[PDB]
Structures are given as C-alpha cells and as structure tokens.
C-alpha cells in the first residue's frame, strides 16, 4: 500500500500529528500503514487505531443518518433518484471503511493477540464494525452480519469477565457497546438494560481498589452506562 515505504515509527508519529490537526482520514491511513508492517500494536498504538477509524466512520454514519431521514420523508411527498443515489454513495463508502478495519483485525491483529487486554480490544472493535455494517444492512445477509457482531462481542465479554477487573475501562466500554447492540440492533432492550445495570453495579463495588487516576478513568465510563440507563428507563 501507499504507506509501505514509510518507517513504522514515522507512521505512528504522523498519526499523532494528524490527531492534533483533527485530520482523521490521514490518521487512519497512517495507522493502517503501521498495522500492515506486521508487528503487534502497543496499548497506545491500539488507541490511535481506534480513535482514527472511530472518527472517520462516525462522520460517515452521521451523514448516512441525515440522508436516510431525508430519503424516508421523500417516500411518505413530491417525487427523483438523487436522494437514494447519494445515500447509497455514502453507505458504500462507510461499508468500505468497515471492511478495511475488519480486514486489519482478520489479517492479522486478532490471531496474534494473546494478552487479554489486546485480544478483548480487537474483538470489541470487530463487534463495533460489524455493528456499523448492521446499522445500514437490509438484505439477505443482515442476520449474518448481526450474528457476526454478536459473536465477536460475546467472545470479548467472556475473556474480559475471566481476565480483567470489573472496573477495567476496556471491559466497561465493551459492555456499554454490547448493551447498545442489544438495545437497537438485536431488538433486546431488556438484555441491554440488564447488561448496563449489572456492569455498572459490579464496577461500583470494585472502585475501592483503585488509585485516584484509575478511579477517574472508570467512573467516566460508568457515567455513560448511567446515561443510557436514564435514557432507556
């Protein structure tokens, strides 16, 4: 790829610069290049990868929702194909980004990740990007896309429960996202609420073990679980 000639360390340095410049497409390209060097990623590097693609796909998803809403209102209205065409364009670009991320996870980040922190991180990302594919899916394969998200989240949950404390921020963000998966993808709002509550309560009971800085990190994510519970109940 286009980043094959750049040093791994230079790609990581430039990913950090792109983050500071809010140039997230560049950031994602640099981190894709770094992954393709073939070496495992550090905790910091995994976060750079996640931040870059989160922001890229987040813009695409927000645009897709705007266009989908316009398209829906047009199908209630004065009549052409332009709205559908442009929604499809954004959708296809979004699917391409999701496919690229899933391809990095499959070649070969997940299979080389042996530590719980790295393996859970990548399986959570796999669930997230199948979930984003599920958000726009409508055809023969929607159920398989949903089950791919579920399966990745479930394996991440199983490992995280066995190997990480209940306040671990990756464990908490995994549970947050699997809860949202249940609520709005799988049509299982009770499972979503149950998971958010049990996750919150088990984290609260472990806070006493933490330093001041870890306490801040954990309670930040616990508040997101609380926000969703307040929205859903």
């Amino acid at each position: 790829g286009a980043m094959g000639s750049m040093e791994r360390a230079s790609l990581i340095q430039k990913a950090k610069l792109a983050e500071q410049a809010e140039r997230y497409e560049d950031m994602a390209a640099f981190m894709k290049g770094a992954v393709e060097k073939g070496e495992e990623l550090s905790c910091e590097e995994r976060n750079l990868l996640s931040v870059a693609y989160k922001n890229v796909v987040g813009g695409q998803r927000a645009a897709w929702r705007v266009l989908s809403s316009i398209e829906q209102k047009s199908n209630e209205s004065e009549e052409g194909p332009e709205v559908r065409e442009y929604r499809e364009k954004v959708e296809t670009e979004l699917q391409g980004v999701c496919d690229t991320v899933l391809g990095l996870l499959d070649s070969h980040l997940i299979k080389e990740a042996g530590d719980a922190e790295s393996r859970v991180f990548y399986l959570k990302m796999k669930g997230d990007y199948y979930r984003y594919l599920a958000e726009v899916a409508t055809g023969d394969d929607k159920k398989r896309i949903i089950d791919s998200a579920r399966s990745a989240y479930q394996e991440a949950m199983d490992i995280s429960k066995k190997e990480m404390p209940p306040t671990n921020p990756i464990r908490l963000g995994l549970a947050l996202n699997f809860s949202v998966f249940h609520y709005e993808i799988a049509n299982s709002p009770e499972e979503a609420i149950s998971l958010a509550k049990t996750t919150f309560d088990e984290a609260m009971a472990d806070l006493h073990t933490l330093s001041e800085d870890s306490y801040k990190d954990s309670t930040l994510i616990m508040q997101l679980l609380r926000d969703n519970l307040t929205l859903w109940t």
Binding site: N177, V180, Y183, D227, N228, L231
Partner: peptide, 5 residues
C-alpha cells in the same frame, strides 16, 4: 439525547 457508545 442520543445513546452513548
């Protein structure tokens, strides 16, 4: 509000 992830 939009749910959080």
């Amino acid at each position: 509000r939009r749910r959080q992830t």
